[PDB]
Amino acid sequence: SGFRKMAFPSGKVEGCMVQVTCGTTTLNGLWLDDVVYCPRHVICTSEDMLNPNYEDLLIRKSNHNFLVQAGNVQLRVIGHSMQNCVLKLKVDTANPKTPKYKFVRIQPGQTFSVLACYNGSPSGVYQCAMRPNFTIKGSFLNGSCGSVGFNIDYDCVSFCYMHHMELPTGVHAGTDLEGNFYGPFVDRQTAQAAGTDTTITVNVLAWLYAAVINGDRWFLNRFTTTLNDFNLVAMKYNYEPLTQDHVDILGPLSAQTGIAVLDMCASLKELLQNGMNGRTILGSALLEDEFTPFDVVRQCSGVTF
Amino acid sequence: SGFRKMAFPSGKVEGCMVQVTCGTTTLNGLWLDDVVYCPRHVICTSEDMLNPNYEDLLIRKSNHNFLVQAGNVQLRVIGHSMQNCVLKLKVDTANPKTPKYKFVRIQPGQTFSVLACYNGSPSGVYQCAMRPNFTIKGSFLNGSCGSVGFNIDYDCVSFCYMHHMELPTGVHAGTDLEGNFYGPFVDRQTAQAAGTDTTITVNVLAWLYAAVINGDRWFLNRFTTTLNDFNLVAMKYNYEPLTQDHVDILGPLSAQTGIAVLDMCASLKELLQNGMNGRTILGSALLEDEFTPFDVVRQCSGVTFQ
Ligand SMILES: CCNC(=O)[C@H]1CCN(C(=O)c2cncc3sccc23)CCN1Cc1ccc(Br)cc1CC
Ligand SMILES: CCNC(=O)[C@H]1CCN(C(=O)c2cncc3sccc23)CCN1Cc1ccc(Br)cc1CC
Ligand SMILES: [Cl-]
Ligand code: NA
């Protein structure tokens, strides 16, 4: 038993991290097959970054301007191009450690593991959710750009995030691996701000189920509610709407625990209205919203990779 | 910016995980060089588990009674020995993925990464602290025995924990890699209970420093305290004593933030008295005690957001 914020094993991704240098800038890249992917902002001086013309800046660069190092081994760049906000450096060597992989774009509320890297070297791993406002609450310092986020299923690494920048409020923004930003952000040093965030309701419900599975049940009650009535409450408390698809996805946990989703919604309604009255749930005094239903089932059933 | 419970990248340890089977029991082992380490309770049946005589159980085993599988490959056992509560199986193949490594026995309050594994296959990685009562609060199911805990400061893997059992209170117990239990526990299914746990005071202080580094000061106050008065108060909230060693270890964080250690102690005293009044610290509504001073320096900026 026990329930912890758990990342995927990172080994398959560690073997893909490289160091990319352009002029005075060093950041991280992802080496898959014979391509290294990194943020296109690698090509910008501090002055360029204020208002970059990436097409014009890139035309002035040749292959030789990009130095790529995998551990102690130099990879020779033999081509370069941009896709959206990602730079693709074709290299002369296919990564022998390339895992089975896909590029996937995730939706708000979904979780993933971040492998924080500096100078091409992995430094730490932790779980994040894509917030409703399309930021992530990561932990990133100067030099972390090009760090990636991923999920695993069986043997296949699904890459979903590449880190581009920190916003003024200390949260993080980036792209999918095809270089499309999550959220209304651009790769320019200009005033940008995350929208007001909301709480991921379906994930809070999942975590309440995790709590029940782990023997923490004080918040259960005799009441139920309707989807409509619950959603009036969610809106009042800055929670995302709960949809029928969310209810369907939670169906397993309902069956296992004997608490229908709308039953658990009545618990959540009461917690929102009344607080915890000095108690905790799974050791938390806040309602946790960065576990998906799948995360709960995975962890509670010991799925391996 | 940001502050998360951050594990070490697990790849160096993943390449060492194997499955060990003895009779009907399968659990995890750690394959380093030509040795596989696992809990000695692998040799016990359910009948054996109350009062196992491990010497008597082991003498009855041959090398070929142990099956070791690394992925799809069977490793041949060519010797075995018991060291304290760990079994060491000598195998005919050195692990080609053996990282630079060492074995370290840690003290209460120290943190490490756990790679939870089942059937020799990794499931996930997360951070744990050795609690003052020598348990850990992990996430471990049936089949997770032999999962390990480790740090990877400076490219070398320091193995510090091997998982042996869950206690009745739902917390976890295990050994160092020399097979010595943390705490008073034994590898027998007899009544044992952990001591009442306490809060790791030095770690709470470290995390308050992390909050200041990351730009938040709301919880500071104009007061100070002596060390002895701090301890008299904090013990009333089930906090561990703060020692001069702890004060010394907090020196770098104190220097980076300009907040004297005993002044941060005065802040903590007031937080214990007052609660948060609806605020959070680094996204938490409780006082976090599973980040060490070293963990904070590892993760945070060296420049305070003033
Ligand atoms: C030389 C030109 N490159 C830059 O300026 C790089 C510098 C490196 N950065 C990091 O390594 C870092 C990452 N993650 C967290 C932190 S906290 C302090 C530093 C970081 C910050 C990102 N900026 C670009 C940038 C900055 C702001 C905005 Br808005 C947009 C953009 C464009 C996407
Ligand atoms: C066949 C004889 N072996 C056993 O019985 C094994 C069975 C496997 N176990 C696990 O895989 C497991 C791990 N971590 C968490 C959980 S939650 C449910 C199960 C687990 C539990 C540990 N016990 C032994 C055991 C049990 C209790 C105590 Br006290 C001491 C001991 C001796 C050290
Ligand atoms: Cl230690
Ligand atoms: Na109910």
DSSP annotation of A303: -
Q: Is the CB of residue A85 less than 8 Å from the CB of residue A164? A: yes
Distance CA(A304)–CA(A17), nearest Å, equals 23
Strands A17-22 and A66-70: antiparallel
Can you list the alpha helix ranges (DSSP code H) found in A53-133? 54-59
Partners of B159 in the beta sheet? B103, B150
The length of chain B, given as a count of residues: 306
User: Which one of B41, B163, B164, B172 is the catalytic residue?
Assistant: B41
Classify B215 in phi/psi space as left (phi over 0), alpha (psi -120 to 50) or beta: left
Q: Please, what is the angle between helix B261-274 and helix B201-213, to 10°?
A: 100
Q: Is residue A258 packed enough to be buried (19+ CB in 10 Å), middle (13-18) or exposed (0-12)?
A: exposed
Q: Is the CB of residue B86 less than 8 Å from the CB of residue B38? A: yes
Ligand 1 atom with the smallest distance to the CA of A186 is 33
In 3D space, the residue among B17, B67, B15 whose CA is nearest the CA of residue B42 turns out to be: B67
Residue B143 touches chain A, beta carbons under 8 Å: yes
Enumerate domains of chain A plus CATH numbers.
1-14+100-197 (2.40.10.10), 15-99 (2.40.10.10), 198-301 (1.10.1840.10)
Q: Is residue A154 packed enough to be buried (19+ CB in 10 Å), middle (13-18) or exposed (0-12)?
A: exposed
Hey, what are B266's tokens? 């005065």
Hey, what are A34's tokens? 């014979």
Residues of A in contact with B10 (CB under 8 A): 9-11, 125
Q: Determine which helix (DSSP H) or strand (DSSP E) holds B111, and give its type and residue range.
A: strand B111-118
Q: Read off φ and ψ for residue A168, nearest 5 degrees.
A: -55, -25
Partners of A111 in the beta sheet? A129
Hey, what are A289's tokens? 């919203």
Ligand 1 pocket check for A65: Cβ under 6 Å:
no
In 3D space, the residue among B204, B122, B84 whose CA is nearest the CA of residue A14 turns out to be: B122
Q: Is the CB of residue B128 less than 8 Å from the CB of residue B138? A: yes
Distance CA(B114)–CA(B124), nearest Å, equals 8
Q: Is the CB of residue B69 less than 8 Å from the CB of residue B120? A: yes
Distance CA(B73)–CA(B22), nearest Å, equals 17
DSSP annotation of B181: B
Residues of B in contact with A283 (CB under 8 A): 137, 286
In 3D space, the residue among B129, B146, B164, B187 whose CA is nearest the CA of residue B5 turns out to be: B129
Is the CB of B123 less than 8 angstroms away from the CB of A305?
A: yes
Q: Is the CB of residue B202 less than 8 Å from the CB of residue B132? A: no
| Residue ranges lining ligand 2, Cβ < 6 Å | A 1; B 25, 41, 44-46, 49, 140-145, 164-167, 187, 189, 192
Q: Determine which helix (DSSP H) or strand (DSSP E) holds B162, and give its type and residue range.
A: strand B157-166
HSE, CB side, 13 Å, CA atoms: give it for residue B89: 33
Distance CA(B13)–CA(B27), nearest Å, equals 16
The alpha carbon of residue A282 is apart from the nearest alpha carbon of chain B, in Å, by 11
Q: How was this structure determined?
A: X-ray
> What distance lies between CA A89 and its chain's CA centroid?
24
Q: Is A44 a catalytic residue?
A: no
Distance CA(B220)–CA(B94), nearest Å, equals 55
Q: Is the CB of residue A88 less than 8 Å from the CB of residue A36? A: yes
Q: Is residue B188 packed enough to be buried (19+ CB in 10 Å), middle (13-18) or exposed (0-12)?
A: middle
In 3D space, the residue among B112, B111, B165 whose CA is nearest the CA of residue B292 turns out to be: B111
Q: Calculate the dihedral angle through the C-alpha atoms of A33, A144, B138, B242, rounding to the nearest 10 degrees.
A: 160
Partners of B80 in the beta sheet? B89
Hey, what are A24's tokens? 């005075």
Q: After what residue numbers is chain A broken, C–N > 2.5 angstroms?
A: none
Q: Is residue A209 packed enough to be buried (19+ CB in 10 Å), middle (13-18) or exposed (0-12)?
A: buried
Q: Is B44 a catalytic residue?
A: no
CB atoms within 10 A of CB A256: 13
The alpha carbon of residue A70 is apart from the nearest alpha carbon of chain B, in Å, by 16
Q: Report the SS3 class of residue B26.
A: strand
Partners of A264 in the beta sheet? none
From B20, B40, B42, B49, mutation site for ligand 2 pocket: most ligand atoms within 8 A of C-beta = B49
| Distance set, CA B277 to CA A237, B213, B218, B268, B272 (Å) | 19, 22, 11, 14, 11
The alpha carbon of residue B61 is apart from the nearest alpha carbon of chain A, in Å, by 30
Q: Determine which helix (DSSP H) or strand (DSSP E) holds A265, and give its type and residue range.
A: helix A261-274
In 3D space, the residue among B278, B270, B160, B186 whose CA is nearest the CA of residue B222 turns out to be: B270
Q: Is the CB of residue B205 less than 8 Å from the CB of residue B265? A: yes
Residue B96 touches chain A, beta carbons under 8 Å: no
**Burial track A68-90 (b if 16+ CB lie within 10 A, e otherwise):** bbbeeeebebeebeeeebbbbbe
Residue with the smallest CA separation from ligand 1 atom 23 is A165
User: Which one of B145, B160, B265, B300 is the catalytic residue?
Assistant: B145
Ligand 4 centroid to Cα of residue B37, in Å, is 47
Hey, what are B28's tokens? 């995890």
In 3D space, the residue among B238, B116, B123, B121 whose CA is nearest the CA of residue B172 turns out to be: B116
Ligand 2 centroid to Cα of residue A1, in Å, is 11
What is the identity of the amino acid at B201? T
Is the CB of A4 less than 8 angstroms away from the CB of B138?
A: yes
What is the identity of the amino acid at B44? C
Ligand 1 pocket check for A145: Cβ under 6 Å:
yes
Q: Read off φ and ψ for residue B227, nearest 5 degrees.
A: -60, -40
Residue with token string 């200009």: A190
Distance CA(B299)–CA(B8), nearest Å, equals 11
CB atoms within 10 A of CB A48: 16
Q: Report the SS3 class of residue B175.
A: strand
Distance CA(B172)–CA(B138), nearest Å, equals 6
Residue B275 touches chain A, beta carbons under 8 Å: no
Q: Is the CB of residue A234 less than 8 Å from the CB of residue A241? A: yes
Query: What is the maximum span of chain A, computed from C-alpha positions, in angstroms?
Result: 69
In 3D space, the residue among B129, B44, B139 whose CA is nearest the CA of residue B85 turns out to be: B44
Ligand nearest the Cα atom of residue B105? 3
Strand B25-32: give its sheet, edge to edge: B73-75, B66-70, B17-22, B25-32, B35-39, B86-91, B77-83
Q: Is the CB of residue B209 less than 8 Å from the CB of residue B200? A: no
In 3D space, the residue among B205, B183, B203 whose CA is nearest the CA of residue B193 turns out to be: B183
Residue A137 touches chain B, beta carbons under 8 Å: yes
The alpha carbon of residue A294 is apart from the nearest alpha carbon of chain B, in Å, by 14
Hey, what are B39's tokens? 């809990």
Residue with token string 């097979």: B179
| Distance set, CA B182 to CA B132, B160, B166 (Å) | 10, 10, 13
Q: Determine which helix (DSSP H) or strand (DSSP E) holds B129, and give its type and residue range.
A: strand B121-129
Ligand 2 atom with the smallest distance to the CA of B186 is 33
Q: Is residue B41 packed enough to be buried (19+ CB in 10 Å), middle (13-18) or exposed (0-12)?
A: buried
Give me the resolution in angstroms, 1 decimal: 1.2
Distance CA(B299)–CA(A6), nearest Å, equals 18
Q: Please enumerate in sequence order all residues whose Cβ is within 8 A of that of A73, keeping only pairs 6 or more positions apart, or say none.
A: none
Q: Is residue A67 packed enough to be buried (19+ CB in 10 Å), middle (13-18) or exposed (0-12)?
A: middle
Residue with token string 């898959």: A32
Ligand 1 centroid to Cα of residue A174, in Å, is 11
Q: Please, what is the angle between helix A293-301 and helix A201-213, to 10°?
A: 20
∠ Cα B293 B295 B301 (to 5°): 95
Q: Is the CB of residue B253 less than 8 Å from the CB of residue B296? A: yes
From B50, B147, B166, mutation site for ligand 2 pocket: most ligand atoms within 8 A of C-beta = B166
Residue with token string 């918040």: A219
Q: Please enumerate in sequence order all residues whose Cβ is within 8 A of that of B117, keeping only pairs 6 or more positions apart, or say none.
A: A304, B17, B28, B123, B144, B146, B147
Q: Determine which helix (DSSP H) or strand (DSSP E) holds B35, and give its type and residue range.
A: strand B35-39
Distance CA(A128)–CA(A143), nearest Å, equals 19
Beta strands in chain A (DSSP E): 17-22, 25-32, 35-39, 66-70, 73-75, 77-83, 86-91, 100-103, 111-118, 121-129, 148-153, 156-166, 172-175
Distance CA(A276)–CA(A267), nearest Å, equals 11
